[PDB]
Ligand binder design. Structure first.
Ligand SMILES: *[C@@H]1O[C@H](CO[C@@H]2O[C@@H](C)[C@@H](O)[C@@H](O)[C@@H]2O)[C@@H](O[C@@H]2O[C@H](CO)[C@@H](O[C@@H]3O[C@H](CO)[C@@H](O)[C@H](O)[C@@H]3O)[C@H](O)[C@H]2NC(C)=O)[C@H](O)[C@H]1NC(C)=O
Ligand SMILES: *[C@@H]1O[C@H](CO[C@@H]2O[C@@H](C)[C@@H](O)[C@@H](O)[C@@H]2O)[C@@H](O[C@@H]2O[C@H](CO)[C@@H](O)[C@H](O)[C@H]2NC(C)=O)[C@H](O)[C@H]1NC(C)=O
Ligand SMILES: *[C@@H]1O[C@H](CO)[C@@H](O)[C@H](O)[C@H]1NC(C)=O
Ligand SMILES: *[C@@H]1O[C@H](CO)[C@@H](O)[C@H](O)[C@H]1NC(C)=O
Ligand SMILES: *[C@@H]1O[C@H](CO)[C@@H](O)[C@H](O)[C@H]1NC(C)=O
Ligand SMILES: *[C@@H]1O[C@H](CO)[C@@H](O)[C@H](O)[C@H]1NC(C)=O
Lengths: 12, 309, 47
């Protein structure tokens, strides 16, 4: 889940 | 079987449905498919939406927070194989926080070649206990299917024929419990005879060729497969790519010219995810492995005398 | 007063709203294992 959020949520 | 549509690259569809129509002509997605974070969509947005051409995804399928989507039966009716070449944390199929999903409905999904299934935190999701995943994956011990409506005794999953006092669906045994298998109230789970192994069978239950995977239009014919066990070559399923073809993306046979055209498209604008493709050990690949450099005249990886440039 | 899992998504959904989320370590590290401020979190919104 945290692995999910890290992969999908990206700033820039 | 020669594919009616295109081979499309991996996609990531977010926020609105506009970009989803980029899939309209794909037969194969050569990459992954992620559909996520659609907060203002409603069931009416999906009433007239279908991608019947999609047969296979080489990597993984991930669905997360797509509001208003109640079933996938109209979206991906013909998706037969998810190869799992690349996976999302060991999963080839991820259904997470799909707040309105009432059923999966992937009634043509016959095989997940590699990886497991994670179906978690779907508060309306039923038609899970009715699926025999042992017919789809070897590794079912790594499935993580929890925190769905299905957890309690409120689903009452009703399979085709029940109202008429019939068992239209095939029943299978999962650890001592014998149960009728289906995807929705109106679609059974296809189950083939044991003799077919992983090859699939026609509608009439006749085994597909050993080079098929999941389904075929005619029995014991490698030009009549819906999807291939090993490699695909101009509407035919083959064990390995013969010369003069190269193995590409672990599922298809391509010629030198194809590999070359990819290489020379990736000239200017290093963006949008491009590589200058090379030949190494009868494979057409993104880049030479470490210790090799690419001989320019023939795309061939050669080892470097001293460190590589 | 950190943000994890469901709370994190709900917060991103509120902050981003109609803009949606951007694409092409991560947020867990910045906002869940550690506390982050609104200016960090909003950097995950699409333009
Ligand atoms: C999915 O496929 C449709 C249908 O067309 C198919 O794909 C083409 C690439 C060819 O291989 C066709 O033989 C095949 O039927 C695509 O729709 C088509 O889009 C093009 C524009 O990209 C349309 O052409 C335009 O026509 C107008 C005049 O009406 C001109 O002003 C333009 O300059 C341009 O030529 C074409 O009419 C349209 N075809 C149909 C049947 O609607 C579609 O783009 C494709 N989707 C994706 C995402 O690739
Ligand atoms: C070598 O292969 C290329 C590309 O292969 C095409 O795509 C494959 C997935 C498969 O469906 C092949 O049969 C296809 O040919 C060939 O170049 C293409 O040729 C077709 C016509 O046959 C044409 O529609 C494409 O536009 C061509 N591509 C380009 C960029 O010109 C190539 O001719 C093959 N060469 C040999 C000798 O086999
Ligand atoms: C989809 O989002 C894009 C990007 O913000 C926008 O250009 C487009 O108008 C949107 N379409 C709909 C129907 O919301
Ligand atoms: C899925 O397909 C692969 C073919 O590579 C096969 O090894 C696997 O056992 C199949 N599983 C089932 C249960 O069909
Ligand atoms: C397998 O593919 C064929 C393609 O013609 C289709 O007609 C058939 O119904 C599929 N098998 C089943 C029973 O789903
Ligand atoms: C490698 O590249 C050089 C220069 O392009 C060429 O002379 C050489 O013959 C190539 N290697 C092979 C195996 O032909």
């Amino acid at each position: 889940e945290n692995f999910l959020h890290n992969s999908i949520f990206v700033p820039r | 079987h020669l594919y009616p549509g295109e081979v499309c690259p991996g996609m990531d569809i977010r926020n609105n449905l506009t970009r989803l129509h980029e899939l309209e002509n794909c037969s194969v997605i050569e990459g992954h498919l992620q559909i996520l974070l659609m907060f203002k969509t409603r069931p009416e947005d999906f009433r007239d939406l279908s991608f019947p051409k999609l047969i296979m995804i080489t990597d993984y399928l991930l669905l997360f927070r797509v509001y208003g989507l109640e079933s996938l039966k109209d979206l991906f009716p013909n998706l037969t194989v998810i190869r799992g070449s690349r996976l999302f944390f060991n999963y080839a199929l991820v259904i997470f926080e799909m707040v309105h999903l009432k059923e999966l409905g992937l009634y043509n999904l016959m095989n997940i070649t590699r990886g497991s299934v994670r179906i978690e935190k779907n508060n309306e999701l039923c038609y899970l206990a009715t699926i025999d995943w042992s017919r789809i994956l070897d590794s079912v011990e790594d499935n993580h299917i929890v925190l769905n409506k299905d957890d309690n005794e409120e689903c009452g999953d009703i399979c085709p024929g029940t109202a008429k006092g019939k068992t239209n669906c095939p029943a299978t045994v999962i650890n001592g419990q014998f149960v009728e298998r289906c995807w929705t109230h109106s679609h059974c789970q296809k189950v083939c005879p044991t003799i077919c192994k992983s090859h699939g069978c026609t509608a009439e239950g006749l085994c597909c060729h050993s080079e098929c995977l999941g389904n075929c239009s005619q029995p014991d014919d490698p030009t009549k497969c819906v999807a291939c066990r090993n490699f695909y070559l101009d509407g035919r399923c083959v064990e390995t790519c013969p010369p003069p073809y190269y193995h590409f993306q672990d599922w298809r046979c391509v010629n030198f010219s194809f590999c070359q055209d990819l290489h020379h498209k990736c000239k200017n604008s290093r963006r949008q995810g491009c590589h200058q493709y090379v030949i190494h050990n009868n494979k057409c690949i993104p880049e030479c492995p470490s210790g090799y450099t690419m001989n320019s005249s023939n795309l061939l990886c050669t080892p470097c005398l001293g460190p590589c440039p | 007063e950190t943000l994890c899992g469901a709370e994190l998504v709900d917060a991103l959904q509120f902050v981003c709203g109609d803009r949606g989320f951007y694409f092409n370590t991560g947020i867990v590290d910045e906002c869940c294992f550690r506390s982050c401020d609104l200016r960090r979190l909003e950097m995950y919104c699409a333009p």
